[PDB]
Design a protein around this ligand. Structure first.
Ligand SMILES: *[C@@H]1O[C@H](CO)[C@@H](O)[C@H](O)[C@H]1NC(C)=O
Ligand SMILES: *[C@@H]1O[C@H](CO)[C@@H](O)[C@H](O)[C@H]1NC(C)=O
Ligand SMILES: *[C@@H]1O[C@H](CO)[C@@H](O)[C@H](O)[C@H]1NC(C)=O
Ligand SMILES: [Cl-]
Ligand SMILES: [Cl-]
Ligand SMILES: [Cl-]
Ligand SMILES: [Cl-]
Ligand SMILES: [Cl-]
Ligand SMILES: [Cl-]
Ligand code: NA
Ligand code: NA
Ligand code: NA
Lengths: 155, 164, 155, 155, 164, 164
């Protein structure tokens, strides 16, 4: 059966405060692993039809040595998105996150999101992760990851 | 058999994998352990039987961490909290160093990844601030200012000089 | 094998600030799907014995155009409950959530909860979701949902 | 197939404000169950090779009758750790949590964490849970738990 | 067959399990229901057919809960919020009792797990505080102080005594 | 074969499904594509081969969203932030419109789902407030008040009239 557990590529995490689609994950390193699925720049492609369980864990962190978080409005979010190489538009499968106040006097701020779902996937369909504040992403392999594993067949 | 560098499996005595290599496939009845070298950014520090190598920890600057040494394929990467911060095992983060109250000074030399040690100000020295870096500074010598020592100083305040 | 992925029925979300058991979900629409299980007014009924994995994702949101959140005490919670058509009393399987301060000056507040567990279920037993503040529920199909899928047999 | 769902041993929750590895769970009581896996003082030992799905739900709570939370710096965390009876050092598989401000005037504060992942486990390897503030742990069986179930074989 | 203490399965009529016991294995064509007693800290309160017993709820002191009775193998454990707090079904927690404003007093006797009931102060009584416990206290008798009643009191304030 | 309205599968050339219909079952060796219409509240806007139809987005009033058009079975529902708010792609929410500082006015006409554009006040006009709606208002004509223009106004303040 096919599966995937992709941890964040710590050396290729985008910068800025705008929402982006993450385009770099590990696939064969540490806890990162992939089988009978293909990965191309943050797009985990399904090679075999079936019902998969999709999950994602996203950790945001900020230390005071990096400066200060501006605008005061802070909404740390994660969207698990299903794209396709036949239809241009993409669609959210799962959504998670929280508005936060990180304007305190503490030296470190941390927050993690977790999402999980049972979805019907066809070959050719692709799963991708997009986050709100990539500059706040935790590069740790136990912190920021997303994955999938087949449970049943479609028939 | 031998406890070090060897392990028993399926009756026979097989040899473990040297640091820098992982156990790709364990011993068969017709061959010994097959050991392949650790991949990029991976490592193993002991004589093991692991299926795969461990991935080096990320010295995240966003956690105020910095690498002392990057480590090899046989060595763990070692991180430390940057200047002014010490590692805290409970939160696994770089906590702000403890400030030393007036009357106390930060002991020198300041340690790399450790919290500030506060020592009371000795005779002839004072501290008038809260600081995790500043140590006990000596009283001002009134002669250098072309003045005289009016009132003697304490551990929390400097002496006062008068142009009398 | 039996499964279910139920998204919130956006047109039938209860009002008020009291904890209620959600009694309306989608079962065949968008990502919503059900197989070899029955759904009757928010009660996902098990038709086949086995060990299932239960999960729920609940999103709470509030915009300033809706007014203001009173009482100041705000505890956004989710309880995954196992009822039964043989015993009147119901019991919590999983619990999640957080106390929140949404009295800020920001125009939008958001928070998501996620729970997951491996449980032994018998035919006739029913799973239901109850939330603390239904008037704050996110109607999106990627936001508010709960599901189940069989992993192993009981034997 | 092997599995485990361990709820917190409510009568043996450690005290203090230091991070500890939880060493007492229920294994055959209420929703707590275990099969073809062994449990020894908070270390869920794997007896059979395979790809497992690991999950943990941790709830933190505080009422005002217990006093007040000191230091003001509060980071509620959970680490799912893989140890081994052949190598002394342990390694984090999953990490979750959030920094919190519980210095308000409310009588009750609550927060839950959830983590989930698909991992490759060998016989002999052990899974354990460690939390930051054990004195804030929710003793409820639906609140604080961790588990595992085999999905596929390694081959 | 009989609705109470009995259940139908595979055509035949089987007997249910008494409170304190769970249905280990249901009726076979050659035997009746096998019922085993509930384990430690477990319970079943009705005539059931459950695979396993329910676990007693935890009266967490950390939630300001206390046990009225621990319950048996046939009985649910019953909890209550400690002094000054009442159980709230919406949050499933022990919420702080409602304070009674000046002019109002907390009705006695105070209930165990219920919220404070506020009653207006009657004639000759007053309340000058916000309290969920304090009831309407009687006006001070000026004679006891060896004084005289200058101005009469209200429901929010006491009378004033003068040494005239 | 043909790139539009057609797709190749199992060698043969099959026809796609028209907008408003989904691909129930793909082409068999003995039949073409079977296309069923989209269910309630569902839609498909292109010539597709999808297993099921897409569900229309929810124009949540709780997110300050309102529907411009509900959309058909061949059309996506389109939402917009209500008055005073603009859609932000980063947070996927209706953010508060930017206020124009004194000396600047909100350009009109105000857009439906877009943020306020701030334009400096021209000669003879002023703005003395922070507002995302209020534009530059003209100076008061002192003649209308039966008075005279004492001091000329600016871009941040009005003129002052005296009854001299
Ligand atoms: C890295 O490898 C070199 C090889 O000579 C070894 O000497 C050194 O000790 C290793 N580093 C650490 C931290 O072990
Ligand atoms: C506990 O068991 C005793 C046995 O006599 C019974 O009388 C009592 O009612 C039980 N407690 C409750 C709360 O039912
Ligand atoms: C809805 O359907 C009608 C059918 O005539 C079509 O004209 C219209 O363009 C559709 N709406 C949208 C937004 O495409
Ligand atoms: Cl890789
Ligand atoms: Cl789906
Ligand atoms: Cl439906
Ligand atoms: Cl269970
Ligand atoms: Cl137990
Ligand atoms: Cl792994
Ligand atoms: Na000092
Ligand atoms: Na009162
Ligand atoms: Na203005």
């Amino acid at each position: 059966q096919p599966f995937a557990h992709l941890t964040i590529n710590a050396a290729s995490i985008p910068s800025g405060s705008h929402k982006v689609t993450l385009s770099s994950w590990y696939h064969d390193r540490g806890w990162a692993k992939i089988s009978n699925m293909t990965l191309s720049n943050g797009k985990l492609r399904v090679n075999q039809d079936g019902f998969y369980y999709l999950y994602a864990n996203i950790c945001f962190r900020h230390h005071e040595t990096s400066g200060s978080v501006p605008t005061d409005y802070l909404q740390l979010m994660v969207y698990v998105v299903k794209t396709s190489i036949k239809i241009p538009s993409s669609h959210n499968l799962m959504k998670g996150g929280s508005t936060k106040n990180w304007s305190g006097n503490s030296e470190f701020h941390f927050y993690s999101i977790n999402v999980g779902g049972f979805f019907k996937l066809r070959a050719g369909e692709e799963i991708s992760i997009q986050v709100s504040n990539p500059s706040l992403l935790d590069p740790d392999q136990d912190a920021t990851y997303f994955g999938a594993f087949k449970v049943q067949d479609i028939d | 058999c031998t406890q070090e560098r060897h392990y028993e499996h399926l009756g026979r005595c097989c040899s473990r994998c040297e640091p820098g290599k992982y156990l790709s496939s364990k011993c068969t009845p017709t061959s010994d352990s097959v050991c392949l070298p650790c991949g990029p950014d991976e490592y193993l520090d002991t004589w093991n039987e692991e299926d795969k190598c461990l991935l080096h920890k990320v010295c995240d600057a966003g956690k105020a961490l910095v690498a002392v040494d990057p480590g090899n394929h046989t060595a763990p990467r070692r991180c430390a909290c940057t200047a002014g911060y010490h590692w805290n095992s409970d939160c696994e983060c770089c906590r702000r160093n403890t400030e030393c109250a007036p009357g106390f000074g930060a002991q020198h030399p300041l340690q790399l990844n450790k919290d500030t040690v506060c020592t009371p100000c000795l005779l002839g020295f004072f501290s008038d601030v809260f600081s995790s870096t500043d140590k006990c500074k000596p009283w001002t010598n009134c002669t250098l200012l072309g003045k005289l020592e009016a009132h003697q100083g304490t551990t929390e305040s400097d002496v006062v000089c008068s142009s009398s």
